[PDB]
Amino acid sequence: AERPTLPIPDLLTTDARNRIQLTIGAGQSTFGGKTATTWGYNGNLLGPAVKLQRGKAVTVDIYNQLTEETTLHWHGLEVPGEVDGGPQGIIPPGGKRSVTLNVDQPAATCWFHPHQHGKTGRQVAMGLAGLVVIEDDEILKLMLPKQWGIDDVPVIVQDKKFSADGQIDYQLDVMTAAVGWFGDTLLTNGAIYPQHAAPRGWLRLRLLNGCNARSLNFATSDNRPLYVIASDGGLLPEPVKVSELPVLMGERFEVLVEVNDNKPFDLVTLPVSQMGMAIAPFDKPHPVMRIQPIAISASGALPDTLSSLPALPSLEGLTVRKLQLSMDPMLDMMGMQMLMEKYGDQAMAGMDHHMNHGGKFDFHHANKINGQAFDMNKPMFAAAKGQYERWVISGVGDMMLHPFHIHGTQFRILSENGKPPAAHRAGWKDTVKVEGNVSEVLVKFNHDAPKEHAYMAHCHLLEHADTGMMLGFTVG
Ligand SMILES: [Cu+2]
Ligand SMILES: [Cu+2]
Ligand SMILES: [Cu+2]
Ligand SMILES: [Cu+2]
Numbered sequence: 001a002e003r004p005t006l007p008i009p010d011l012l013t014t015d016a017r018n019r020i021q022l023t024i025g026a027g028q029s030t031f032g033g034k035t036a037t038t039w040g041y042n043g044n045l046l047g048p049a050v051k052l053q054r055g056k057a058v059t060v061d062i063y064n065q066l067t068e069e070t071t072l073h074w075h076g077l078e079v080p081g082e083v084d085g086g087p088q089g090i091i092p093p094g095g096k097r098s099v100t101l102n103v104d105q106p107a108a109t110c111w112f113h114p115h116q117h118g119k120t121g122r123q124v125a126m127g128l129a130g131l132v133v134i135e136d137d138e139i140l141k142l143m144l145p146k147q148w149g150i151d152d153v154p155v156i157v158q159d160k161k162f163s164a165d166g167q168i169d170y171q172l173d174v175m176t177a178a179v180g181w182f183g184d185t186l187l188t189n190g191a192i193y194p195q196h197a198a199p200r201g202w203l204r205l206r207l208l209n210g211c212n213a214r215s216l217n218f219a220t221s222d223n224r225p226l227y228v229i230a231s232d233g234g235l236l237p238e239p240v241k242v243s244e245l246p247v248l249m250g251e252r253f254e255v256l257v258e259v260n261d262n263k264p265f266d267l268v269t270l271p272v273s274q275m276g277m278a279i280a281p282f283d284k285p286h287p288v289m290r291i292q293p294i295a296i297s298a299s300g301a302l303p304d305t306l307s308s309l310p311a312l313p314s315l316e317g318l319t320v321r322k323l324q325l326s327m328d329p330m331l332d333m334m335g336m337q338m339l340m341e342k343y344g345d346q347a348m349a350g351m352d353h354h355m356n357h358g359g360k361f362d363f364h365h366a367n368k369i370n371g372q373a374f375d376m377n378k379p380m381f382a383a384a385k386g387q388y389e390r391w392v393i394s395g396v397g398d399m400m401l402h403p404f405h406i407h408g409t410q411f412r413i414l415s416e417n418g419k420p421p422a423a424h425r426a427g428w429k430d431t432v433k434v435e436g437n438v439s440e441v442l443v444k445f446n447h448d449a450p451k452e453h454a455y456m457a458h459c460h461l462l463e464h465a466d467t468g469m470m471l472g473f474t475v476g
């Protein structure tokens with residue numbers, strides 16, 4: 001059998017009333033010939049790409065046709081807390097919520113997904129994620145590849161595992177609370193190892209790591225380079241040529257790759273040094289999708305310059321906030337034990353050389369920031385509006401991977417886990433690596449968030465956030 005074609009999310013724009021309609025619902029999908037109940041936006045699985053324009057307002061009508069509560073968060077969008085869709089943004093089952101997004105940030109690929117309190121991992125694992133394509137005047141002048149689904153394609157990469165009956169096998173338990181939910185099956189826009197037919201010249205890939213817990217590292221099967229043009233929050237100042245591209249959970253990068261006649265190649269993910277993530281088939285390079293060259297010329301350019309990246313300011317005088325991430329030692333030890341018992345030494349490949357005691361020892365609140373498991377009723381602090389702050393985020397005390405994400409902003413990384421950031425990570429980011437060390441970011445919030453609709457800051461290893469590694473904060 002031939003490989004399925006890469007599914008392409010519909011690129012959705014507003015109607016005459018200026019509205020975009022999103023319906024959240026359950027249906028069936030097929031994986032390896034076996035049906036599974038899945039959830040999607042405007043469909044059975046995953047979701048559309050919502051197209052937004054800087055300086056224009058759109059209204060999104062969100063219909064929850066699930067039988068449980070959910071929320072819809074716009075990861076990477078700089079919007080007020082009231083429309084941010086964090087855990088306080090509840091949409092009742094069978095209900096509708098509408099939000100107006102006043103887009104005011106540069107062109108970027110953002111995304112959206114649920115933020116249901118303590119259930120975000122499950123709801124994403126079930127299928128809910130969509131994309132946001134923000135454009136502005138600046139990006140269109142660059143004449144990058146721009147034909148959606150032809151030479152400009154989104155690539156949402158996710159793992160799942162399935163039970164013998166074919167259903168998605170999700171659990172939030174002591175093991176996954178420590179190391180995350182991960183699986184053995186890799187999906188690319190929902191499909192297993194699809195092919196994408198691309199014209200000769202430049203191919204633009206908008207890469208999203210949509211895994212709950214698995215970090216990825218993209219490369220090509222024949223070692224042709226990737227030219228990074230954009231990060232979470234938009235364009236880099238100029239392209240950055242890489243041979244491999246690590247992507248943390250929830251991160252986006254846009255890359256250009258050359259397509260030449262008669263030479264198909266795969267986009268692959270390389271084994272990572274993260275606990276549990278190098279179990280077969282992920283102990284070796286793993287194909288993500290096959291690029292099939294078409295002998296028709298592609299019109300897109302890779303310009304020498306993309307955008308202007310403003311200078312980092314002086315750091316003296318700016319508020320410094322400490323965010324200490326932590327995991328309960330016993331539940332970290334127990335989750336790791338369970339992982340080692342199940343998979344053996346392979347669960348640490350590539351790394352460096354039973355009774356009820358009550359609610360105090362519950363793994364559901366074992367993960368914390370500044371000694372507190374997330375309390376939705378108590379924002380931990382009030383950040384300044386329109387002022388640069390230096391946020392210092394520490395994972396000293398455990399060796400788990402914490403891609404730390406801050407709502408309401410695109411920031412600049414000053415130190416990523418104890419080193420200056422790589423060039424392609426030095427632009428606009430909404431995620432920073434924290435793993436047994438300390439990161440520092442320079443952040444500014446341009447919009448208000450009240451106690452009732454607070455911004456979140458949390459680990460994007462979703463099972464950590466669901467078991468307490470999140471805080472709320474207000475702005476204004
Ligand atoms: Cu997110
Ligand atoms: Cu977010
Ligand atoms: Cu974490
Ligand atoms: Cu979030």
Ligand SMILES: [O-]
Nearest residue numbers: 073075405460
């Ligand atoms: O998030």
